[PDB]
Design an enzyme around this catalytic site. Structure first.
Site, PDB file in Angstrom:
ATOM      1  N   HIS A 111       0.820  -1.212   0.000  1.00 49.60           N
ATOM      2  CA  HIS A 111       0.000   0.000   0.000  1.00 49.60           C
ATOM      3  C   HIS A 111       0.859   1.269   0.000  1.00 49.60           C
ATOM      4  O   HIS A 111       0.652   2.177  -0.821  1.00 49.60           O
ATOM      5  CB  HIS A 111      -0.954  -0.076   1.197  1.00 49.60           C
ATOM      6  CG  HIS A 111      -1.927   1.056   1.310  1.00 49.60           C
ATOM      7  ND1 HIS A 111      -1.639   2.200   2.022  1.00 49.60           N
ATOM      8  CD2 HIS A 111      -3.207   1.190   0.886  1.00 49.60           C
ATOM      9  CE1 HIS A 111      -2.687   3.004   2.004  1.00 49.60           C
ATOM     10  NE2 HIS A 111      -3.651   2.416   1.321  1.00 49.60           N
ATOM     11  N   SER A 141      -7.158   6.374  -0.658  1.00 50.07           N
ATOM     12  CA  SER A 141      -5.713   6.250  -0.482  1.00 50.07           C
ATOM     13  C   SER A 141      -4.938   6.559  -1.753  1.00 50.07           C
ATOM     14  O   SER A 141      -3.769   6.927  -1.669  1.00 50.07           O
ATOM     15  CB  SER A 141      -5.339   4.830  -0.071  1.00 50.07           C
ATOM     16  OG  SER A 141      -5.654   4.557   1.273  1.00 50.07           O
TER      17      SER A 141
END
Length: 279
Positions: A69, A224
Site C-alpha cells: 500500500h 488512499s
C-alpha cells in the site's frame, strides 16, 4: 514536458477534460521539494524511485513495506512513470504494519516525527505529507494532523472509503488539513468515496496504476490513491513557487476543475485537482 500513455489519473490532473492519456507538466517536476509518505513503508529499491526514496522511520521490526500500500501511494506521489512530482524526494514513515493496520498512538507519533524530522532534511521548495489512512473520529488524531500542518507541512489526508460523511473519520475530519475524495476516469465520484463539507478536493482514485512491492506494479482503488495525487500536486506547485505549504490546499481548490464531477452530494465541493499547466 509530456508523458505519453500515462496512467489516466496523471493525464486527468493536467487536463480540462476526461478521456485523454498524456500527462503534461513543468519539467521542474517537484525538484527541491520533499514528500513524506506515512503508511506501510516504501520499497525504496524499486527502479521507479530512481534513488529518490528512502525510509526514515519505522515503529515495527522492519522499515520494509511488506504490504504494498505505501509503495503504491509513494509511486503516485513521485515515481518516474506513475508519479505526479517525478523529481521530488520521498521519505517513508512506517506507522502501519504489514497488514495495513496501526494504532492511533503510533500514527500520532509518526505525524509529530515528520513535523520535527523535516528540520533534518533539505527541502528548499517545501514539505508535504501524504496520509492514506484513517479510522473513526479522534480529536487527538485530528490535533496531530493540525500540528503537522501548523509546523509548515502541506498535509493531505484520505477522506475514507465508507461512502459516508467524512466528519466521522480522522484525520479526514480535521478542518486545517487537505481532505481528499476520490473520482473515476469518467469524472464520477468513486463508489466508495466519503463526502461531506470537510472535503477540500477530489483526485483520481478508481483503478490507479502505480508501483508495488517485489519491483512490480498494479492497479488498485481508494481514497488512499487520490490523496497522493494531491500531495504530489502540492509538491509540484510549491517547487514552481506558485503556493506554500500553508496555502497549497486552498490554491489547489482555487485552481481546480469546477463542477465537472457527477454524483457529488449537495453540500460537498465539486472540485477536481488540476495543475493548470500550459505547455
Amino acid at each position: 514536458a509530456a508523458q505519453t500513455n500515462a496512467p489516466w489519473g496523471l493525464a486527468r490532473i493536467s487536463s480540462t477534460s476526461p478521456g485523454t492519456s498524456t500527462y503534461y507538466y513543468d519539467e521542474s517536476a517537484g525538484q527541491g521539494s520533499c514528500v513524506y509518505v506515512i503508511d506501510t513503508g516504501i520499497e525504496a529499491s524499486h527502479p521507479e524511485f530512481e534513488g529518490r526514496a528512502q525510509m526514515v522511520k519505522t515503529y515495527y521490526y522492519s522499515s520494509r513495506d511488506g504490504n504494498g500500500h505505501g509503495t503504491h501511494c509513494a509511486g503516485t506521489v513521485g515515481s518516474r512513470t506513475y508519479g505526479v512530482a517525478k523529481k521530488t524526494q520521498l521519505f517513508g514513515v512506517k506507522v502501519l504494519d504489514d497488514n495495513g493496520s496501526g494504532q492511533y498512538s503510533t500514527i500520532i507519533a509518526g505525524m509529530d516525527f515528520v513535523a520535527s524530522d523535516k528540520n533534518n532534511r533539505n527541502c528548499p521548495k517545501g514539505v508535504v505529507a501524504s496520509l492514506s489512512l484513517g479510522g473513526g473520529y479522534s480529536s487527538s488524531v485530528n490535533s496531530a494532523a493540525a500540528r503537522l500542518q501548523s509546523s509548515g507541512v502541506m498535509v493531505a489526508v484520505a477522506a475514507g472509503n465508507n461512502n459516508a460523511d467524512a466528519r466521522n473519520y480522522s484525520p479526514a475530519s480535521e478542518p486545517s488539513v487537505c481532505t481528499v475524495g476520490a473520482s473515476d476516469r469518467y469524472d464520477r465520484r468513486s463508489s466508495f468515496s466519503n463526502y461531506g463539507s470537510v472535503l477540500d478536493i477530489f483526485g483520481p482514485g478508481t483503478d490507479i496504476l502505480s508501483t508495488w512491492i517485489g519491483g512490480s506494479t498494479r492497479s488498485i482503488s481508494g481514497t488512499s490513491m487520490a490523496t497522493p495525487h494531491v500531495a504530489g500536486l502540492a509538491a509540484y506547485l510549491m517547487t514552481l513557487g506558485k503556493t506554500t505549504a500553508a496555502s497549497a490546499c486552498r490554491y489547489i481548490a482555487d485552481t481546480a476543475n469546477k463542477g465537472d464531477l457527477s454524483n457529488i452530494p449537495f453540500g460537498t465541493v465539486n472540485l477536481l485537482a488540476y495543475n493548470n499547466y500550459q505547455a
